[PDB]
Amino acid sequence: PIYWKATNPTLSPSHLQDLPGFTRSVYKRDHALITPESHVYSPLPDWTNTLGAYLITPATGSHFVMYLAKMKEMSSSGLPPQDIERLIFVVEGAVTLTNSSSKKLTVDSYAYLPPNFHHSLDCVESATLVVFERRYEYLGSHTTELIVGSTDKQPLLETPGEVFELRKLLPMSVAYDFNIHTMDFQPGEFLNVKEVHYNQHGLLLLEGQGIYRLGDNWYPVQAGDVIWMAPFVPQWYAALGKTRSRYLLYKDVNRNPL
Amino acid sequence: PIYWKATNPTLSPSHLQDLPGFTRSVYKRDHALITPESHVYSPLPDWTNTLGAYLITPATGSHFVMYLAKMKEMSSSGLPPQDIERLIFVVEGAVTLTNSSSKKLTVDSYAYLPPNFHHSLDCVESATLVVFERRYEYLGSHTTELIVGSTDKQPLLETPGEVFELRKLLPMSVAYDFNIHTMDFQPGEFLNVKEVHYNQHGLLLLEGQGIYRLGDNWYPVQAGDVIWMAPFVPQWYAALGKTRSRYLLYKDVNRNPL
Amino acid sequence: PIYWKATNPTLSPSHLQDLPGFTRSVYKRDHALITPESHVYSPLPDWTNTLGAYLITPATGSHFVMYLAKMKEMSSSGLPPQDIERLIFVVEGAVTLTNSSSKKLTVDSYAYLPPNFHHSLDCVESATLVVFERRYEYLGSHTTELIVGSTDKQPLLETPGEVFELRKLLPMSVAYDFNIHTMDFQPGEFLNVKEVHYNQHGLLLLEGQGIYRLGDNWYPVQAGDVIWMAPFVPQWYAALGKTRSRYLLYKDVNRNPL
Amino acid sequence: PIYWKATNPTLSPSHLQDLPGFTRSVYKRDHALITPESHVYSPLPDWTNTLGAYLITPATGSHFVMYLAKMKEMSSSGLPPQDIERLIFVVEGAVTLTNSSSKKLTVDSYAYLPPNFHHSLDCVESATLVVFERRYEYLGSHTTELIVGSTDKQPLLETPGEVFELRKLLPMSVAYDFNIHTMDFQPGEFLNVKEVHYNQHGLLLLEGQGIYRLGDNWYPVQAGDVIWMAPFVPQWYAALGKTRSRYLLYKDVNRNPL
Amino acid sequence: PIYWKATNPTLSPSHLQDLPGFTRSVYKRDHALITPESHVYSPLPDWTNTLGAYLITPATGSHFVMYLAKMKEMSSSGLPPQDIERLIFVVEGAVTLTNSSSKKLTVDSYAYLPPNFHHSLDCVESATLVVFERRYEYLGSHTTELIVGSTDKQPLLETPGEVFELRKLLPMSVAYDFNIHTMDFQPGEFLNVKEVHYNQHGLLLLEGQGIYRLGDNWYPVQAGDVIWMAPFVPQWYAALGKTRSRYLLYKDVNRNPL
Amino acid sequence: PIYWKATNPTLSPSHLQDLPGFTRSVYKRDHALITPESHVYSPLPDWTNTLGAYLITPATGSHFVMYLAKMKEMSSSGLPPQDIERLIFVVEGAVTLTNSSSKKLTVDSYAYLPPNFHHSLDCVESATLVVFERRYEYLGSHTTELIVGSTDKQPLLETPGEVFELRKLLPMSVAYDFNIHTMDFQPGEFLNVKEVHYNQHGLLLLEGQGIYRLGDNWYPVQAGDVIWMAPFVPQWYAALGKTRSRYLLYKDVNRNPL
Amino acid sequence: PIYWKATNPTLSPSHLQDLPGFTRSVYKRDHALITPESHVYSPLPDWTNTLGAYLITPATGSHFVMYLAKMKEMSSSGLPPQDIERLIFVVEGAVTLTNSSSKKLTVDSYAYLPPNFHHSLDCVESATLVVFERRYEYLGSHTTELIVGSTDKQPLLETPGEVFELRKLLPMSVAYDFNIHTMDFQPGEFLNVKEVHYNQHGLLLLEGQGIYRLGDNWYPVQAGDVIWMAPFVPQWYAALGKTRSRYLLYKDVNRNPL
Ligand SMILES: [Mn+2]
Ligand SMILES: [Mn+2]
Ligand SMILES: [Mn+2]
Ligand SMILES: [Mn+2]
Ligand SMILES: [Mn+2]
Ligand SMILES: [Mn+2]
Ligand SMILES: [Mn+2]
What we know:
The structure is cut from a larger assembly and holds 7 copies of chain A.
Chain A: E1 26-27, E2 31-34, E3 42-43, E4 50-56, E5 65-71, E6 75-76, E7 84-93, E8 95-98, E9 103-105, E10 109-113, E11 120-123, E12 127-135, E13 147-150, E14 165-168, E15 178-185, E16 201-207, E17 209-214, E18 217-222, E19 226-229, E20 235-240, E21 245-252
Antiparallel strand pairs in A: 1-2, 2-19, 3-4, 4-5, 5-12, 6-11, 7-10, 7-12, 8-9, 8-11, 10-13, 14-15, 15-21, 16-19, 16-21, 17-18, 17-20
One manganese (II) ion is lined by residues 195, 201, 235 of chain D.
């Protein structure tokens, strides 16, 4: 299945049961490498029969949350707080979306919901969702709207001076205050620019493995690893191995950095 | 006696009189190990014949306060600020609580007082109080209520994939924005998950000894030690020795982290 | 041309194509060294056919933003939000100011813009500007007005206790919350006071090279480099090579550090 | 099977096939943590069909070698240089030792061959051997001699001030310049003395897991891991889990340190 | 030309002429990264019209030297001291080797001279040689002999557990106490085994670029770079970019490590 | 009792019985701080009924050995290997020495023994001696001779630029390659010279407490502590408390540093 | 007064008289910066009324010594051991050299003495000498001769790709296994090559001031400072201020580094 290793990591939590205290996770001043055996699942408030693990919250200094959601048999989502926009990405399984016709989202499907937009995600079997939420930044008479889609149905964008394959999930229109990029590196390929920008990131490695650099820290990574990149931290990546690398990325945009 | 070493640490301050500047205490970006020889006791404003030593305050980035109150003869407590909730746990001594009847609190006894709830703690001989205070986060029309009890009465809670015995002092209801856990470990037992969560902690080791890991730091701990765990700091623990480990722990709950 | 080595640094990005992930940039808690291989250019909103890269933003804990704007053939600028004073400085090219008259702004020609002071920049061929923005701290009734000039036209001010050549593009009258200094160093010359002050800095080395100190970190620098100095961060410089050193410097002034 | 995890580690090399460059191994000035995914097996000189991995050699600053020997079907050992004493301990399999009769060795069986003592190890199927060799420090006329045994047959020794169960495979008389110990720790138990001695070590954890402290470094460990301890390195261990800990240890003795 | 970048590194020393003191070179306790801007060339004693730069000498704790020799018009080699075996490798130009016979050596050509083997390297126009010298370690009554060849004529050896392409320039027989390896990696390929071995290394990256891990340090590397690996330093490499990586590697062999 | 705190230190091993893995001991590149909880006692070879604890040996790079010998009932010294010179100092108890009119030495007594000078130390009750030993560096004809004495019956020497009070147990004459110093410091006094010399030290604090500086490390110290100072390590000491600091110091002298 | 500050540093020990333990001295693994407050002066053996302080000895990993001899009222210089070569530099004062005729060495005068060569220095008043002593390495049948002279009498030398003015005090002739250079930099100039080589230095900053880079370390240096440079340490210098930088330097040459 697609994204299988993102749910079944080559180095899983159980392979460490005889290494007391060991972990690959790190939380530093400007970034964080959050790995599978550190995930903290607990009932998701307001949700019905769902465990979740918060990987990133503004406690870190971000303006967004990023959490994993384990939905099981007959379990439903619950409305997010007032003025909070939400974005979900099916990483495994299938869930149904409803408010104009019930759309069924399987793997690789995603859905954006404008702040205060009444909806419900219901599941009847399994489903592992990767969700992003943020207190929307109203700007002028500008507003967002319901977006539903599939990665593959998104066109390959131009990447001046880069070789990775880029696909954006939400519209690039000024309304949206963040977008979800899908980036792919073939084995050996890497980022030419050593980005240093006020933007901030939260990412999930869906396929492959490689080396990710943050500040003066170099980290080996595998499918399933999660990373938080705080504004202005030097970032870089290289894809390694026989298979390609794909990571889901959150990026804030269309707003004055003041 | 119950919690005797918590009040009489094996390695005491006087023991260090011949080691200028020496301390086991460490205050870092996302945590802190606060030890006895560093406690700063000063009279608690609005209290009677009660010496207090604050160990954690929002100055650290937390949203709660943690302090020890050494109540001597004919001592009494003072009401907390407006909208501030309070919780006291008796480590040593006896103290009566009034408001609906009148409860006598001894070692292992505790009491949660809702925000703006009138009450008074009065000590005849002496009492040692470990208390947490916080600005209550009102969630709709929910409100808390007086809670009284003692650890030895709270049922053992099972936690999946873990081996430590757990007890929760307060109700798990949505109205409470924090709970106090009691965690026990037999010598040799440890946390299977190396937690990284949005939740923040404040902890006190009542009995036992062991190794506490915070981020990339490892600290030997003995009863009486206090720890501050900021959000997302990697945390782990292992119980060592002949006797068991037991620690009181604050944990924020039921509120959207966004 | 003057400042040419800023637009074209000796050690330029392409010279690093065969050093995967290699970078001279550093982002620490109290300072930052942003180099050319890390600039992230994205289309500046409200501007016309122009790429821009933010180098400093409040996310760093500053009260100001500093960015590079690469104006191309037939381009114009956008107005900043409300109460955002703006200063621009031409490091290369030419661009006409407009709105009260119309100045042909070229290399070394800067233009201040009071808050909400409507104005516009337009370029027919090509221009590169280093612009600073920040929410003006309204002091009493005092207010600002348009200012336009050139680096070589400003006076050489005395520098008590120091040897570098000092200039200030903007007035010192308390109406201005920030000032932009010009500093010249002859090979072998260095700052005499290991400054430690509340003021914050953002700087671009316009000409030359030398060693820059920040806290306990020492960085070799060349023209085109950019530095971020947070308050209270120990700073120090020394110019080297056969040619003098010159850097554009932002500095906050005339406002209670309270 | 005895010591099954020592040869089939819970966190094995394969589990790390998707984490490029990752390793739990460390080599520092005064110690080393050598783990499986780092063993370098090469044909052993003078041996027949036997791959070997040197874990420790005098390049480290030690006076002994410690290597692993994978003896496959129909194999035999080779004689060691002149004046080199040898000790072999069987971790997996079986091998016959001939030369005073021939003995069939098995897991837990060990043989010590004095310097220049003709012998031959002949394996028919498989056998894993941990061996130590050293340029014997002759002392006067005393001379060591053939010693063939089995851990279990060895008696437990009194270790004043410690709770671990100790055994020594070789005699304690002056001729021997080193001894091999078998140290057992029950969960929760740990060393009381934070050892700092001139004696150097080489160890292999056969069963269990725990934390090993070396200087200011703390390492989680599991059966299979190997430690190099240089003279005078602060050392400490703690056993953890459900199962007990057992490590093989080399120790130089009976020779004036000056 | 073959190995061009190796002769003219992408990031050449001149490119850094405006960065006083800057360098990619590192010299640590158990390894080193020697780069072009650090090459110290000097008249090589006993040679004629040849500049030499020693990169590694036993002062590092190695048992061999490694240097680049810049032979100019009408130049000739100098004999190595008694018992000093020598191996040369041509990375640029051409030189002749006389005295048994005479071979014309171009790029990729090499010659191993046994200890005390009289010879001579005469170059007409110019050539660049990376040469290795070591005091030969006599074992019993074995002796090495002249070996001359070409990397390409050498056969691809089996690399069990790895995917890279391996070639060995000298015989693997007992007489040789070291061999020089040629290792090729296609982009995205890396070492599966994170080596920790007593063998020490001398390395020159002839083609490609990538990331090298030495202990807990990561280094971006390019053609022309040189690395020193002391015994037991954890090592790892991953090739990145469009073209493959190739590196010359010295390795000590066939001698007992005690 | 004299030097009582040296034998029974304020902070003692048993005070840390609940602090798993904790120690004040440090073993670095240029120095060491060996504290009581790290002392490793084992039967001293040839000695009778005595347990020794080597604190310093050549393995550290020193040219001497320093150890504490604890002699019990009917105990006696043993002879040091050939050509070795021995110095003893009784810190607790009583020992008699013979071989010419025997002698009895009590706390604060001592005796130097020329290389190969036959002698015997006979104790009844018990005594704890701190002893040094080295391979005497013969300076041609020069020879050493037996010595007996007591710190207090030894003259106070000059100490220009230094406020402390000194005493040298051995004669400064050329035939002696080392002496033992006694340095007293009064609360608040400290070494004015921030030493960096070829000499090497072994220092046991007998009285007082304070702060010793070694390189960039600052170590709080208490009577009983022991320090290893390698050549050229920046050293320093300041005394604190109500009492005075007093330590026994080894210093190599009278030999060419070549 | 030529070389005044070298004898009376701008930052003096007495200035640090109220900074307990402070020192600018650094002694690391591969290098060292020794400053004025750390010099340990003690009576030089075999000398007459001369206080000497050893700055660098083979204990550092050097093959030479470098000390300062303070010659007072009627003082003589003791003879070096057998086979030890010796060079002397008069930093200040006056001393007379006699074996073949008398020689009056004054500030800037130097004399090199071959091994086993007989000579004597005699001082009436004061004289500060910086001397280097080394066991001579006999190559073939070459022998060195006695050399005497002054810096400015020495010719300027070609400094390819460099700008500092060079001068050598000894013959580059093969017989000599070391030389002493005089290097001058103007304020602002610096080394282009960030040197990494087998040669080992021992320098004295005679005039000027600037920044010295050793490894990843940056040290502000002043006249009077001393530096030990072990083989292969990355090194670099920059002169600064109004006067010029001038430093004396040791460097081993003409010997195979095997
Ligand atoms: Mn980015
Ligand atoms: Mn927790
Ligand atoms: Mn400033
Ligand atoms: Mn031990
Ligand atoms: Mn290797
Ligand atoms: Mn000293
Ligand atoms: Mn040099």
